[PDB]
Ligand binder design. Structure first.
Ligand SMILES: Nc1ccn([C@H]2C[C@H](O)[C@@H](COP(=O)(O)NP(=O)(O)OP(=O)(O)O)O2)c(=O)n1
Ligand SMILES: [Mg+2]
Ligand code: NA
Ligand code: NA
Length: 318
DNA sequence: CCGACGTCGCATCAGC
DNA sequence: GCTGATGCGA
DNA sequence: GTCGG
């Protein structure tokens, strides 16, 4: 409905993050683009827009300019700027953030072609990002996510039948496609008071996991691909997080999302005397002092503690 | 007016 | 060599 | 850039 406005605010958001290194301004523009994306009328003026939470004076002014001229001078200008447009573009490679993109552009390295002929100036993550630049920008249809899930749940059970693994994120909520696969792993032997490596190893042995971005005792980030004389599947981003059993369901709730649904839930639990981080749910004592983590054995437990009726993953976009 | 705005695991760098 | 900081993508 | 104490 207001596609021109929300694209403009998303573009400005990227320049803030990537060129100006102004992360809070990036988040501001994104919040503004979001609140406007959901607004159920075609906007007529910046003043109409300013009524929304996240839209302030300068964005109301920007909308005014867009509506009257169909563009924004400042944006048109930065788009045409070689240095800035190249900086913003390089950050599309995974592992090249604002700072590595600035340095490349400083020394004349501006395009994927230039990155291709300068491998030795790329760290390991950035090579993998460049290798899969196009793949990493595709979404994953549900059907492939389900085949991916089949492999992961199978290999994980085969390594030790007492692992518990859950694929979270937009997939756990039932979305028709997904940007990545987030797997949450726990084992009854691991609580708060080798397990990851065994799983990653087995997924590599069956050639499901094809590259490693980073790997510690608790978190793996990397790349995987379904088996193929039909055209091969795109490489996909996979994360595997190993979480102590007593924190597993807080992890699951959180890494299931949505973004927005998380936020309300956290707020609802405040205005109920509980604090929910990704790890624990804790009570707030009569003056804001957090007490001990409360036992949690399922998602539902958390929902009870704060008297909300267990909400299905599919019903969690807010 | 003026500070918050999410917090953290891992890879790699910067300082010693 | 060791420790803390910073970049990055969550 | 926006919000709010
Ligand atoms: N800023 C953020 C980002 C993520 N999250 C939580 C909720 C998300 O569903 C979950 C995973 O983040 P995500 O993978 O970027 N988004 P999600 O999987 O829901 O959708 P897609 O990856 O399919 O685009 O972490 C959050 O609470 N705040
Ligand atoms: Mg996701
Ligand atoms: Na990047
Ligand atoms: Na990016």
């Amino acid at each position: 409905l207001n596609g021109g406005i929300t694209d403009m605010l998303t573009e400005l958001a990227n320049f803030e993050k990537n060129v100006s290194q102004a992360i809070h301004k990036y988040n501001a523009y994104r919040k503004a683009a979001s609140v406007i994306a959901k607004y159920p009328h075609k906007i007529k003026s910046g003043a109409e827009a300013k009524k929304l939470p996240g839209v302030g004076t300068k964005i109301a002014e920007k909308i005014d300019e867009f509506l009257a001229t169909g563009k924004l001078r400042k944006l048109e200008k930065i788009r045409q700027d070689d240095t800035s447009s190249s900086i913003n573009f390089l950050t599309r490679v995974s592992g090249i953030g604002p700072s590595a993109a600035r340095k490349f552009v400083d020394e004349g390295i501006k395009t994927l072609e230039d990155l291709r002929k300068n491998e030795d100036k790329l760290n390991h993550h950035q090579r993998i990002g460049l290798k899969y630049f196009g793949d990493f920008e595709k979404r994953i249809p549900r059907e492939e996510m389900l085949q991916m899930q089949d492999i992961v749940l199978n290999e994980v059970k085969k390594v030790d039948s007492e692992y518990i693994a859950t694929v979270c994120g937009s997939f756990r909520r039932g979305a028709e496609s997904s940007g990545d696969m987030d797997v949450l792993l726990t084992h009854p032997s691991f609580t708060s008071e080798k397990l990851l490596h065994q799983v990653v190893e087995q997924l590599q042995k069956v050639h499901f996991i094809t590259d490693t971005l980073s790997k510690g005792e608790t978190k793996f980030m990397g790349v995987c691909q379904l088996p193929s004389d039909e055209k091969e599947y795109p490489h996909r981003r996979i994360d595997i997080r190993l979480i102590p059993k007593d924190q597993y369901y807080c992890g699951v709730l959180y890494f299931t999302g949505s973004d927005i649904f998380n936020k309300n839930m956290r707020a609802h639990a405040l205005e109920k005397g509980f604090t929910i981080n990704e790890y624990t749910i804790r009570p707030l004592g009569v003056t804001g002092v957090a007490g001990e983590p409360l036992p949690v054995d399922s998602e539902k437990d958390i929902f009870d503690y704060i008297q909300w009726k267990y909400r299905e993953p599919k019903d969690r976009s807010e």
